[PDB]
Write a protein that binds this ligand. Structure first.
Ligand SMILES: NC(=O)C1=CN([C@@H]2O[C@H](COP(=O)(O)OP(=O)(O)OC[C@H]3O[C@@H](n4cnc5c(N)ncnc54)[C@H](O)[C@@H]3O)[C@@H](O)[C@H]2O)C=CC1
Ligand SMILES: NC(=O)C1=CN([C@@H]2O[C@H](COP(=O)(O)OP(=O)(O)OC[C@H]3O[C@@H](n4cnc5c(N)ncnc54)[C@H](O)[C@@H]3O)[C@@H](O)[C@H]2O)C=CC1
Ligand SMILES: NC(=O)C1=CN([C@@H]2O[C@H](COP(=O)(O)OP(=O)(O)OC[C@H]3O[C@@H](n4cnc5c(N)ncnc54)[C@H](O)[C@@H]3O)[C@@H](O)[C@H]2O)C=CC1
Ligand SMILES: NC(=O)C1=CN([C@@H]2O[C@H](COP(=O)(O)OP(=O)(O)OC[C@H]3O[C@@H](n4cnc5c(N)ncnc54)[C@H](O)[C@@H]3O)[C@@H](O)[C@H]2O)C=CC1
Lengths: 333, 333, 333, 333
């Protein structure tokens, strides 16, 4: 006597189903929604859950995505301040907290976002004990460490976005120089996300041609190709976008969807994301820095061993000391 | 001597090139940027141009998109306040609009958007004489008429977003009720975008099964399936999203990229978009209302003829009267 | 130290993994390989298993797909005459058997397939007890019933290709007549695959406009648009392709990949596939005929009830009698 | 009143539109149809034209693809023995092959193809004066020269498949040793397609880590990883597939669709295809060999300069001498 009962005859008994490829995005700000629309555009989720503390914005974002359902392949979009909505996620993307603000210190940003992660991370693993967490919130290397400690997950299931976007920006800047697609330019930005990153000059190449062999002054102060400036522009181009539009979100959203594609399609592609690097390159503390990592359906299963130069190792160790000096004073992790 | 000279040997001489599939988005607000990221995600553009009056925000958006180039298939992303940047676009998406002032009247807000269009639309056609224009800006049926008048373009090359999003919402809400994908739920919202739209109950079907034959009280006040309430929610769900997050953008972005895909791939798919309906359903003035329209590489080349019911025709005629009453009082078109 | 040992440092311990979306194709003939290339081009499989009795052809097909891996997103392609290679498949596509030289179907021909399927189907469920089976082998409605009986699976997990391809050909022919994309042409070919199929004229529509309402003579000899001839061409166009190239494969490959996409993305999209229709439209025997069915991650979970005409119901009953006449004399089920 | 006249009201007058991204495949054999299905699956063509000398098989392949139209985004699929069908193609794929007689000199086999190509190639350029020609037919380096000479086209519009598939198989074999996606493996097979190709060991890398740096014996007769055997497997794996299934087609079809994607999307990606290499690496004759080439909408616009070792340059020069030894004796070019 219901329309649905006149129209639809069951062949299977209706039952509780669990999604096969559920993704949660925590924080529905600029970055969380760029992540959400990128995941939906690539059809990466059979179920998308959104969480924030702003219950009205959260409901509005959920409804706006639902209204686009005809154009997508995600049959369930749900949102709630309550983490019960996130249950049985395969991947949880954490974009929550506050951006850096002009006039505020790096310590200040650590205190604001560690406060947020202390509430969020235990809730995530309560409902999705088997998930992979992708940490995007800044400062990303500290917050990846904080996530690993609070989550109790194994290292291979806690991934910092780290230098993934730095590398994508570097390959774009190379591409601009040469007039070719960034996918045909190869080069790795590793270590700490942003100011103190390492450009691995020996690896920079097109079609396997070492650009450091063609220009041995690459990365020195006596270089007519000014590669040191290109490395600086990886950092400075982001600050410029932040000054101009207030934040960055589109490139980070696409880069997060690209990580998720590698994992849910079980591809074992190599990405410069952040992993726990104690015992690598002489690092003696528990810190997360970016190295070329293999990603697949298990998470971050392997790292590439590189022949890093003494100056490259020296920067990784100084980064590890800077991170550890902040981390050793964090309480209740 | 330059790295590029050492690395790259020309086979062809460098030459002045014209993009084959250039798209321009006018307005880099939350709607324009949802259009841009949806266009880029579907690889619909070999060149994307952005235009706005906010020079810094425009540059920041352009740079953020460029930083994501590794993940895309759009070799040229450009932005400027000067419409020369839009030259040789195949498709121009207009999302430009002003912010309401505190307590500003409703016909005043219309006149201010019309004054924006009096500058923008002649510039668009100056630089892209061969383009198709998609109008998204509100009020969308009026601003589609304005664009048509100011552009001097034939009616097959000016397309209002109209009820494209209203029909996507309808198919979502009917899909939610039935537990099926919205692509398997068929139903048309026509006429005026928003409050005065027409739900064509007689066409609402699943697998060619008329839901109105199953439930003959569909659309009436004596209906246990409350279909009139579903039509109400098509209108009200949009106001609710605006109340909750301040605006809508994700669904409109996806719907616009769906229209562009029909045109650039020359598919002749049918979409409920706004066209110039003088001479249809007893309408005797130049107004734009939504009907099922065939879209391909020439633009909007055909409309589907419906036998509409008396109440459905009455509402289209009342809508045409409302739009013409506003239009006949606009100057310098 | 192997290359792998110098180059790749483990983060996670090495472990076997169960694929999340493994597909098996049984039979690497023209149809089997069209299904495989369509499955791989849509990235629907994280593991693809191929089975055949021709060991050299099987290994050759496996290697040729593997050589294309750079261009795909399927990290494991395996092939063996032994069904152990098929373990833990979500979906198994059965294309094995004999194909028509021109076209027929009779008790003895089906007993030869039952002889083939009697070995294949128990092997499939032995290694993938939780799979969904898509039957493509002709005669497809009888062999869907045979697969169901031999498998012991519930009816929601055994799906016949049925009239999925017939309906696609119908929508192509409608599109050629009207000059619109087939996705904008709606029409359902139901019942038996091939000669005795039913064209549900009542459901044929563009944009919800009933073409039978514009032409109430549609499907009779009272008809100047000769829609009866379009239905004839759905049947004959297949025989014509077999005449001209020896077999058909591309359209069936694409249509099978479309069914798989609905199920692995859990979409609940509606397709005209073959299901067990005992107790529908007065059918009294266990036979498989095509109706509009909902497909998702559970398999075929529902059927759409339609307001079918007396002559359409007579045809389903006669088809049922025809299939039951054959099945009742099959042995070793 | 035709059905179409009652249903569809023109907004623009009906007009003949020149397709924007038309592709022609010459030869509808195993390789041609692999190219066609990959082109269609990636939505690269608004019009696909097929040409062959076998009228029935050509028409059958055309009809089978048309019957899959619902599942594609190519609104026009055409086929004819007459090259008029190919008019206004952006790209033409040549897979047309005569088979070598079992007591036949290599000069005779190529002259047999020249007698065929002497009709095909002029006919292609007559109907598509602006086209890019991709030559797939074996022997591929000689036939690319023949195509260039007969076409009158500049070097940048004639592309030999060359070592494109050799490099894809090399990356697959690297990837199988490491358990990673072939896209994360980098290595270049250059020069002559097949037995005499050059593996550029100095460019073989993962994440910019030189495998020759890790193993300086890479490619020598004192090599514990036996990379010489991996290079042999690149050649031999193809002969193995021919022995096992009669031919290769799937990997070649995916590789051609990837080249087409670079050019139609104007990406300037680098591919190891065959270009006219007179005046490079001391080569003094008009021959085609594979180098890393930049592909975009103009065709092959640029080549990457490598620092090749003396033994690599000597092999390029030898290959050039072998090709020129045959070409100098060809008549009617
Ligand atoms: N790793 C990288 O490469 C990049 C990192 N980011 C970082 O991503 C983060 C997000 O940036 P935006 O989205 O622009 O910020 P935003 O201010 O637009 O969004 C942050 C959201 O987090 C929510 N939030 C705050 N506390 C929360 C809690 N306890 N639980 C749940 N949600 C909570 C807020 O309500 C807000 O909606 C920042 O830390 C930013 O620095 C941004 C760009 C790139
Ligand atoms: N038709 C539909 O279904 C929908 C229509 N819309 C409409 O889309 C429009 C855009 O909305 P939002 O992005 O949220 O607004 P917004 O105010 O955030 O962005 C509009 C942009 O237009 C720019 N603009 C103003 N004057 C300009 C000029 N002369 N040239 C170029 N750009 C100029 C502004 O600087 C601003 O960046 C509005 O009219 C909105 O109502 C909104 C959603 C759905
Ligand atoms: N349902 C539909 O809409 C369509 C159905 N078909 C049917 O698909 C089937 C396959 O046709 P084609 O691929 O053209 O035939 P084919 O002869 O090219 O391939 C059949 C393959 O099955 C293999 N095979 C036979 N017995 C086997 C066994 N016991 N175990 C494993 N493999 C076995 C053969 O060795 C061969 O490789 C036929 O029954 C054909 O009529 C084809 C077109 C459309
Ligand atoms: N470069 C590479 O890496 C690869 C190249 N190939 C080559 O591709 C070619 C095609 O191989 P298959 O498709 O397996 O052969 P096939 O024999 O299956 O198909 C060849 C087709 O060309 C047609 N043809 C012959 N002469 C013609 C003419 N004058 N005009 C038009 N069509 C004509 C034939 O009728 C036939 O349909 C061969 O030369 C083969 O060696 C094969 C795979 C890899």
């Amino acid at each position: 006597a219901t329309l649905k009962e006149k129209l639809i005859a069951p062949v299977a008994e209706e039952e509780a189903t669990v999604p096969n490829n559920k993704i949660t995005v925590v924080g529905v700000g600029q970055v969380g929604m760029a992540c959400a629309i990128s995941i939906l555009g690539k059809s990466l989720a059979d179920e998308l859950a959104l969480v924030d503390v702003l219950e009205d914005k959260l409901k509005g974002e959920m409804m706006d995505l639902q209204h686009g359902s005809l154009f997508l392949q995600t049959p369930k979009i749900v949102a709630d301040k309550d983490y019960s909505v996130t249950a049985n996620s395969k991947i949880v993307v954490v974009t929550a907290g506050v951006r850096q603000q002009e006039g505020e210190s790096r310590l200040n940003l650590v205190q604001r976002n560690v406060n947020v992660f202390k509430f969020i991370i235990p809730q995530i693993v309560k409902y999705s004990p088997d998930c992979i967490i992708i940490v995007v919130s800044n400062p990303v290397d500290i917050l990846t460490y904080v996530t690993w400690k609070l989550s109790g997950l194994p290292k291979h299931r806690v991934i910092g976005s780290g230098c993934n976007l730095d590398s994508a920006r570097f390959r774009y800047l190379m591409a601009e120089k040469l007039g070719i697609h960034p996918s045909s330019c190869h080069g790795w930005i590793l270590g700490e996300h942003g100011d103190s990153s390492v450009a691995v000059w020996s690896g920079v190449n097109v079609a396997g041609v070492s650009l450091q062999e063609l220009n041995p002054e690459m990365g020195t102060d006596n270089d007519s190709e000014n590669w040191k400036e290109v490395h600086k522009m990886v950092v400075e181009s982001a600050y410029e976008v932040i000054k101009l539009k207030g934040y960055t979100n589109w490139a980070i959203g696409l880069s997060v969807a690209d990580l998720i594609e590698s994992m849910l399609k079980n591809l074992s592609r190599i990405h410069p994301v952040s992993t726990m690097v104690k015992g690598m390159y002489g690092i003696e503390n528990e810190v997360f820095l970016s190295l070329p990592c293999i990603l697949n359906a298990r998470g971050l299963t392997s790292v590439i061993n590189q022949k890093l130069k003494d100056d490259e190792v020296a920067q990784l160790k100084k980064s590890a000391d800077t991170l550890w000096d902040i981390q050793k004073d964090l309480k209740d992790l």
